[PDB]
């Protein structure tokens, strides 16, 4: 679903990264 | 001696770029020296449409109205 | 030589004689270009010959093959295979095609199924949407 929360909206499975596409901009660096 | 290939139109020589004019500035003003025919000695300021460089020969369909406002 | 026959009746249809054999045969309401090309090749007739100048011996084979394509082509080439009432592979043509297809629509209507009700209602019967283009400014049923 996600990794830093559970949200299901923008799950992302590119490569093996499981993030909600909102957290990922905050945990990208 | 004969420059204009046409019959009604008399050729003219661009000798000085004066400035733009017209609505939205698509007309640029030019110092033209009249080539072969009547007004051989006259130097006219006309309005030219399109890009006109220094040294361009343009053809003048008439050679009496100088005219430049195009407000 | 022989003047080109302007009119040729094959399979109960006034086919043109100035068209080639393959593309003139597609005017029949159950024969199209793929079917018309197969009939010409299968019967040995050149599909790009002029149908007007053909001899009558081949016109009958065109007339027989158009009405009995199910004895020439494979089963996967006919417009009624595994027939919903007789179970036999058929290629209906013309008025039997209109009747055969029409007895499938009214069966849905005389049943009140989903596709029957949308056929009675004059609307799209496959998965589509009418919040949209939806409504037809053109004809729905053309067969």
């Amino acid at each position: 679903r996600c990794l830093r929360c559970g949200t299901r909206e923008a799950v992302i499975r590119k490569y093996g990264l499981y993030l909600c596409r909102r957290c990922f901009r905050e945990v990208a660096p | 001696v004969k420059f204009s290939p046409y019959e009604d139109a008399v050729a003219g020589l661009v000798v000085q770029i004066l400035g733009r004019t017209g609505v939205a500035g698509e007309v640029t003003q030019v110092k033209i020296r009249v080539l072969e025919g009547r007004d051989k000695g006259r130097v006219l300021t006309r309005n030219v449409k399109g890009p006109v460089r220094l040294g361009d020969i343009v053809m003048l369909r008439e050679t009496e109205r100088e005219a430049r406002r195009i407000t | 030589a022989q003047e080109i026959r302007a009119i040729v009746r094959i399979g109960d249809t006034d086919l043109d004689g100035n068209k080639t054999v393959a593309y003139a045969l597609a005017k029949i309401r159950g024969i199209g270009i793929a079917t018309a090309y197969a009939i010409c090749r299968k019967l040995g007739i050149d599909p790009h010959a002029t149908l007007g100048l053909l001899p009558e011996d081949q016109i009958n084979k065109l007339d027989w093959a158009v009405r009995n394509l199910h004895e020439l082509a494979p089963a996967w080439f006919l417009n009624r295979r595994k027939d919903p009432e007789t179970g036999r592979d058929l290629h209906l043509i013309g008025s039997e095609l209109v009747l055969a297809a029409k007895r499938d629509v009214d069966l849905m209507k005389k049943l009140k199924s989903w596709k029957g009700i949308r056929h009675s209602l004059g609307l799209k019967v496959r998965g589509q949407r009418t919040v949209t283009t939806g409504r037809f400014g053109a004809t729905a049923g053309v067969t």
Binding site: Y15, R21, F24, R25, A28 | - | -
Partner: protein
């Protein structure tokens, strides 16, 4: 024989810059370049 610069592995994640899609469609290019030698 020596060092050799194998071509780098580039990783892209183009992400929409909006937590609810209000406004212009602005996108975020996130990059993680990997170099390999030998």
């Amino acid at each position: 024989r020596g060092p050799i610069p194998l071509p780098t592995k580039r990783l892209m994640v183009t992400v929409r810059r909006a937590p609810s899609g209000q406004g212009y469609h602005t996108f975020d290019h996130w990059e993680l370049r990997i170099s390999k030698r030998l």
